[PDB]
Write a protein that binds this ligand. Structure first.
Ligand SMILES: CC(C)[C@H](NC(=O)OCc1ccccc1)C(=O)N[C@@H](Cc1ccccc1)C(O)[C@H](Cc1ccccc1)NC(=O)[C@@H](NC(=O)OCc1ccccc1)C(C)C
Lengths: 99, 99
């Protein structure tokens, strides 16, 4: 799908048997999503954006059905305003920037 | 251009007689550039990112050449670790997310 940027590139993701909406962020190196009930064993981790640094939990090996397309990777959970599909899954679904 | 997301999508800009590298970012509705000498009246404003809210100075009607493509926009100068080109100019240079 070709998404233009007049409006926030929000997508539909099915993760953890839960449906969520998420920004497609080429600016984040990492996928970070808001608090959500999720299976597994996690690790502490912190990430930084503008303003500061949040303490996330890292879940390695998670399946997301992004835009009705799948990938498996690292989903970090923590204090975000929006769910961010970062570059480590974007490459997996084969997304690119074009101009 | 076709940009794959495997590396961090930095690119060259020319803002105010100066030459810089900027993250092309779909997750920002705004171009926030680090501090530099920009000449003009500026408003304050404040934006949110993952960790907080930065106090930044609005410059409106500034010309940038992002990849050879000039475009006029509003540009925020303030405390960021990276220059970000947001959707307010990404629309303008014709950029499109894709998969
Ligand atoms: C650049 C900001 C103006 C932009 N915020 C934004 O557009 O908010 C709207 C707003 C407008 C008016 C009033 C209030 C709010 C933003 O933070 N956008 C995010 C995605 C987002 C959108 C809304 C809220 C929160 C997040 C993302 O682009 C940044 C860019 C960026 C990239 C690299 C470094 C710094 C900034 N990456 C991030 O913040 C990611 N960091 C990242 O991946 O960086 C790696 C790294 C970390 C630390 C040190 C070096 C490198 C996080 C998602 C983890």
């Amino acid at each position: 799908p070709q998404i233009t940027l007049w409006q926030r590139p929000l997508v539909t993701i099915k993760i953890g048997g839960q449906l969520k909406e998420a920004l497609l962020d080429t600016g984040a190196d990492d996928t970070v999503l808001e608090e959500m009930n999720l299976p597994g064993r996690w690790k502490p981790k912190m990430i930084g954006g503008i303003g500061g640094f949040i303490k996330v939990r890292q879940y390695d090996q998670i399946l997301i059905e992004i835009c009705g397309h799948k990938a498996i990777g690292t989903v970090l959970v923590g204090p975000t305003p929006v769910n961010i599909i970062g570059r480590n899954l974007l490459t997996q679904i084969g997304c690119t920037l074009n101009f």
